Design a protein around this ligand. Structure first.
Ligand SMILES: Nc1ncnc2[nH]cnc12
Ligand SMILES: Nc1ncnc2[nH]cnc12
Ligand SMILES: Nc1ncnc2[nH]cnc12
Ligand SMILES: Nc1ncnc2[nH]cnc12
Ligand SMILES: [Ca+2]
Ligand SMILES: [Ca+2]
Ligand SMILES: [Ca+2]
Ligand SMILES: [Ca+2]
Ligand SMILES: [Mn+2]
Ligand SMILES: [Mn+2]
Ligand SMILES: [Mn+2]
Ligand SMILES: [Mn+2]
Lengths: 253, 253, 253, 253
């Protein structure tokens, strides 16, 4: 079995691929632009990926990998400004370049399924786009389109940490994402079946993508304070889910 | 730092403490009694704990441990029978003996807070007891009483696997529990703050406790198919949450 | 696969089984007796094992486990006293009681192979017993007898830490033990093939056993300052060696 | 703490940086050239590194990382040919290009200490170079020069697997390397203190480098069959050795 994993409580550019306005400052990963006085900047777009590609599956052996990632983000909006646009954890083709800005979160080009996009992402959408978005702020699973295949309402706690955990079990083909705001003791979870070997390539780069709104008052920050990831690829078709117990304690807690 | 962990995909009595009707057959952990023909038995009560005690905290250093557990259970009710009574993951005093049967799930004595009970458990209640239970089937966090301090409705999928994950972060004092029915793509999550050092002793035994109903037709099985656990105790007061990413992949997926 | 592991940098009686003069003081594991003034006591014998039994193999599936343990010991002899008798890491039958004292290190009864003894131990012998011992101080692998099947000279550094690592690879049936005295930059290693399923039972208790000499001037201390262990049991006959890289960093370094 | 780790039992180019004649075939990592008929090629040179750089230390916090790597190599020499030149595990500057071939193993330029070389490597030298090499085949620790600072004789078993483990403990500043030939039950170990923060940069690329002899009959193959690595970087100066127990079982065994 092939295993790849990492856990960062402190960020330093070397081990990451930064695109757009993504930068590393004070050890945290800042996905979008921020003026010196601390206020967010509109029309921003940043992405960051682990410098090592991860093999999601192997066409020769029919083995599919089971993986998990956990990270803490802090989304803050200036006093009188509205939230926009959101951040997303994504699996993209190794060479991939940023896509449309604004409501596309820098990972998709349209709200129409396009298998050739070869991108899967779990988004934390802070602005409802009338053309494909649910009524309020939400968490959603996007498979080759910005129109999520499943969503769940989310009560964003401005300025308070959000602890996220996303897992994929090759045995049940189930992708699950949960978010927790410790400060408020609120928690949200969402799950859906995703045939990964059909929506993505054998190798992908894992990371984040965030964008701020295209208007003067639709802004927010996107700071990743810590990030963990672990992947396991078997040798036969026989899938083996991961050990989350041992994972979180050895990585998140 | 002190660490203790284990992951069982196959059960064998030696490493576990069995009480009541709990038994190990065909490698799975069967908490309640079952007639030879496969049908569940009423008025049953079984418990099982890892043979090694786990230190939840240290009074001398002020360090509190962060831990996580994940397991898969299959709860089945004969064709025309009703569900009862439920199973619970619990932290109990090392020498502890089973308590009241029936709706008390074998871990509590009353629906009134009794700090001296020194027991905390996350229950998966399949029968609503008018005196302290919510309207329907639910997941709840019990702190020294059978009346949960917080609950969440749960749509039990008869005979289908339930993948559970419970975590405790010493930094936020937050206890979170989530349940997923892969077969139905449904998922539930629930969280609440719990001052562990006040509700439990320094050392505890971790395991399960399940009971069936006290009537002829209120029965169900309680098979644990796999179980993982991991605990980390720091050396100073400074708490450190676990790495769930690395945990699940190295343990659950 | 079944996994069991733990790592203690600080000791506390609850999770261990203590026999003889073994005690836990100031957080370290003291295997042999020591007078209040700090000097060792002759004719001492202490043993300590993890409170959870470990399954070395499964007769039904033909699976053999691969495991590894690492610990730091400090062996000190008063100014003008001679060294005796040694400490040993051992795998013994779950219910096992201490055996002969003195040169038998509390784990064996004779220097003649007795399969029914069902004990395997890696010893760090500090006193040469004319009847079965090599010329000087040594590390040896004992399989059901106090006469090691293989040994290696060892230059004990009085009062300086010794970092030990012992591993067993089910695939090569090879047992390897290495000792390092960081302070002196000296290192020793020793390896031998051992058909474990023939020399031990399915379940064993892992721990230490140490004894001091039976004479007024043959004494030394045996303090274990930290201890790690990890075991993995597959589901088919197909053995899988462990990941020492990930093991030491996640446990020893 | 920052952690990075991986374990490959099967190789696939994507996650690695290949230089020279290094190639991935049949899943194994072949460092040097080999004719289609299977015989090795002279004057060869290949290198391979994990695609993600690893931070060995942080100048700002004074924290030094503790790491460990384990891999299996198979060195074979055609019937009537002599061995040359060797393989080496090395830590090199992130952008680094191969160096001198032949007896320099592709990582060094001279047998004279040159701190600016910023390279540390543990070599498995199969050919004695009169100008800086010990009498026979050996394992050695090279710090910015091809003249090892310490060596140990090694009896190479032609065509038989060699299981290697190299560790670095930031607390003792000790680098230890051990080699085992399971087939022969032989084992070798070697250790030396190395002030890493003085010999290497903050970030390095970890991998292998191998070369064959510059003559018609001095050849041998260099196949890496599996490779594990794990690194842990603390947040304060306080170093913390790794858990090799948990590492090997979770990675090597
Ligand atoms: N990704 C996930 N988040 C929360 N609970 C889970 N249970 C299983 N996978 C999970
Ligand atoms: N116990 C838990 N279950 C699901 N998601 C979580 N996220 C953090 N802890 C969790
Ligand atoms: N137990 C052990 N000690 C030292 N080096 C090893 N290499 C493999 N197993 C080992
Ligand atoms: N790298 C290493 N190889 C073998 N035994 C060891 N003990 C500690 N570090 C070691
Ligand atoms: Ca949107
Ligand atoms: Ca009830
Ligand atoms: Ca002796
Ligand atoms: Ca040479
Ligand atoms: Mn959306
Ligand atoms: Mn209830
Ligand atoms: Mn001996
Ligand atoms: Mn050399």
């Amino acid at each position: 079995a092939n295993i790849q994993s990492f856990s960062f409580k402190n960020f330093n550019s070397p081990s990451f691929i930064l695109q757009g306005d993504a930068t590393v400052s004070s050890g945290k990963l800042q996905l979008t632009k921020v003026k010196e006085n601390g206020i967010p900047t509109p029309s921003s777009l940043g992405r960051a990926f682990y410098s090592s590609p991860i093999q999601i599956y192997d066409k020769s052996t029919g083995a599919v990998a089971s993986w998990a990632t956990s990270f803490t983000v802090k989304i803050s909006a200036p006093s009188k400004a509205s939230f926009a646009d959101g951040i997303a954890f994504a699996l993209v083709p190794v060479g991939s370049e940023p896509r449309r800005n604004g409501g596309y979160l820098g990972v998709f080009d349209s709200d129409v399924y396009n298998n050739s996009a070869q991108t899967v992402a779990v988004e934390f959408d802070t602005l409802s786009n009338s053309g494909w978005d649910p009524s309020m702020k939400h968490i959603g699973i996007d498979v080759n389109s910005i129109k999520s295949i499943a969503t769940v309402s989310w009560d964003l706690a401005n300025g308070e940490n959000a602890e996220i955990l996303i897992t994929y079990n090759a045995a049940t083909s189930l992708l699950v994402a949960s978010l927790v705001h410790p400060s408020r003791r609120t928690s949200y979870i969402l799950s859906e079946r995703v045939d990964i070997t059909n929506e993505l390539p054998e190798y992908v780069s894992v990371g984040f993508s965030a964008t701020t709104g295209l208007s003067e008052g639709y802004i927010e920050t996107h700071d990743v304070l810590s990030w963990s990831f672990a992947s396991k690829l078997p040798d036969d078709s026989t899938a083996e889910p991961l050990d989350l117990a041992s994972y979180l304690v050895r990585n998140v807690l």
